[PDB]
Design a protein around this ligand. Structure first.
Ligand SMILES: O=c1ccn([C@@H]2O[C@H](COP(=O)(O)OP(=O)(O)O[C@H]3O[C@H](CO)[C@@H](O)[C@H](O)[C@H]3O)[C@@H](O)[C@H]2O)c(=O)[nH]1
Ligand SMILES: [Mg+2]
Length: 520
């Protein structure tokens, strides 16, 4: 039959059409327990292939290779394929099963979310259950067309995948609520209203506050970020950003993957410029939360609680989490910290300063140090301004900017109205850098990275090859066992690929984010 023909052709391709042994005899002797799925793990680049190549150089190669492959397929590869193991995971399991044929180091001790990463493949994850989140900032609009179309494109392409959607009914007017419910019914989507969830999570009040405070420093992406760490909302399948495409070629037929931790995230890594004292590059793992996988396991709730306790701590005192951000160098931040202002008041105050259309208000907000930096002033220039600021009106301050640095605005200094706009525009260049950490380091991937162990814990001296990748260093352990993006069928552009050089990240940084409030 064509099935046997297809299998045989795949096998001969995998083993490089070698004539050093008789592949017909070998194929015939293995075919009783050989599937297309297993043959992938015999290909060049695999541990199994590497072992075969060394056996070819020794005596009795025909028999030794048959004995090796029969056992490797029966005991390691085929069981791995059925369980949803990746090629990396199968390579490791083969190396472990055949220490006489493959020299390797032991699994290093790596801690991720308070848990030692395992190579047991014991945590199981469903790829056919997907949850996304949409909180509308416009009461008349349940969801924009882009997001509706994204969900349809996932539903029409795939059943029988279960699609769950968290939203807020309180954010929608009655018509929009009816439309949301109608949409979800038509698309066979399980709807979850965040307004009435039963949970004891400390994150739940914070989510409700983020949404209640829209227009007053709340943020719907921050609300969405926090939902992902409540066990009543997420306990199996994947979280995926609502608009992530599915890569059909990556769908696993058993709809199951595994990992070495009970919660996996989107990961990559960045190889640094050389650092002191040996002029060597460092590999630093990077992570994102646009794809999260949750194991069907009690340990999932345990790990999630560690992260939730960290996020609660950040919300309760955000100034530590923000200590190294641009905003931390402003007078406004220092005042807020002394006053114990909350995250909403911090975000709203920043937005207010940049909506003020006032250089004087911007000065009071930034303080002299950051005002100096933003407007590229000399120390003597900012000293004079700061000494006399209690006497200035708006025009007085503009006159000093014009005298001190007309080049910044290409000597368009004769029209004061235009000059003011140009200086305000220079300041607005920095708004995104001030604002984004107020989500990223608070509820976002910055906070989560820290919750799970922080940079130091995920950064190591860069080391390369040789041969098939094995989990024998910390970044390789995370790459093999902890990365939801590689294993899942969802497409992301949020972060660098694994082992990307810092000078060529190839990540688009978008300007008009959905969750950045405008400042004009
Ligand atoms: O009006 C909005 C806007 C955003 N969101 C939520 O926020 C998520 C991210 O919004 P997106 O426009 O994709 O922003 P990005 O900056 O591209 O998102 C990144 O940064 C966010 C904040 O940390 C994270 O929530 C995302 O997972 C991450 O991909 C969405 O999927 C929604 O869940 C809403 O619910 N309502
Ligand atoms: Mg996005």
């Amino acid at each position: 039959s064509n099935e046997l023909s297809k299998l045989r052709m795949r096998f001969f391709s995998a083993l490089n059409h070698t004539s050093e042994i008789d592949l017909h005899t070998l194929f015939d002797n293995l075919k009783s327990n050989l599937t297309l799925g297993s043959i992938e793990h015999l290909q060049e680049g695999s541990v199994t292939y590497a072992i075969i190549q060394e056996l070819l150089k020794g005596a009795d190669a025909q028999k030794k290779i048959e004995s090796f492959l029969k056992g490797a397929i029966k005991n390691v590869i085929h069981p791995g394929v059925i369980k949803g193991l990746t090629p990396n995971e199968i390579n490791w399991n083969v190396a472990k099963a055949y220490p006489e044929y493959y020299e390797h180091e032991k699994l290093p001790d790596v801690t991720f979310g308070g848990f030692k990463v395992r190579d047991s493949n014991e945590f199981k994850f469903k790829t056919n259950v997907q949850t996304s989140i949409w909180f509308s900032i416009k009461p008349e609009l349940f969801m924009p067309s882009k997001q509706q179309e994204a969900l349809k494109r996932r539903r029409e392409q795939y059943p029988g995948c279960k699609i769950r959607l968290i939203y807020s009914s309180s954010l929608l007017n009655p018509e929009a609520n009816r439309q949301m419910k109608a949409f979800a019914k038509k698309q066979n989507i399980s709807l979850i209203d965040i307004d009435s969830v039963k949970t004891d999570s400390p994150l739940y009040p914070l989510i409700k506050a983020e949404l209640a405070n829209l227009g007053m420093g709340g943020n719907p992406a921050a609300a969405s970020d926090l939902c992902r760490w409540i066990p009543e909302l997420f306990n199996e399948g994947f979280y995926v950003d609502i608009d992530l495409p599915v890569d059909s070629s990556k769908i696993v037929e058993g709809h199951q993957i595994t990992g070495g931790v009970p919660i996996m995230l989107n990961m990559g890594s960045i190889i640094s410029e050389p650092i002191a004292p040996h002029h060597r590059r460092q590999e630093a793992v990077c992570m994102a939360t646009d794809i999260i996988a949750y194991a069907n396991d009690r340990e999932t709730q345990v790990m999630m609680d560690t992260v939730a306790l960290h996020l609660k701590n950040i919300y309760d005192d955000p100034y530590t989490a923000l200590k190294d951000t641009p905003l931390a160098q402003t007078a406004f931040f220092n005042r807020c910290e002394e006053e114990g202002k909350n995250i909403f008041e911090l975000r709203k105050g920043l937005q207010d300063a940049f909506r003020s259309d006032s250089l004087l208000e911007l000065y009071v907000f930034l303080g002299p140090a950051k005002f100096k930096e933003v407007f590229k002033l000399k120390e003597t220039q900012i000293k004079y301004i700061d000494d006399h600021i209690s006497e200035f009106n708006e025009h007085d301050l503009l006159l000093h900017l014009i005298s001190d640095n007309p080049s910044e605005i290409n000597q368009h200094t004769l029209d004061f109205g235009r000059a003011k706009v140009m200086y305000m525009d220079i300041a607005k260049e920095h708004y995104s850098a001030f604002y984004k950490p107020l989500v990223e380091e608070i509820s976002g991937p910055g906070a989560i990275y820290n919750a799970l162990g922080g940079a130091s814990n995920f950064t190591t001296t860069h080391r390369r090859s040789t041969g098939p990748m094995l989990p024998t260093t910390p970044p390789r352990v995370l790459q093999v066992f902890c990365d939801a993006h590689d294993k899942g069928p969802f497409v992301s552009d949020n972060i660098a690929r694994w082992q990307t050089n810092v000078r060529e990240l190839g990540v688009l940084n978008r300007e008009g984010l959905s969750w950045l409030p405008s400042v004009g």
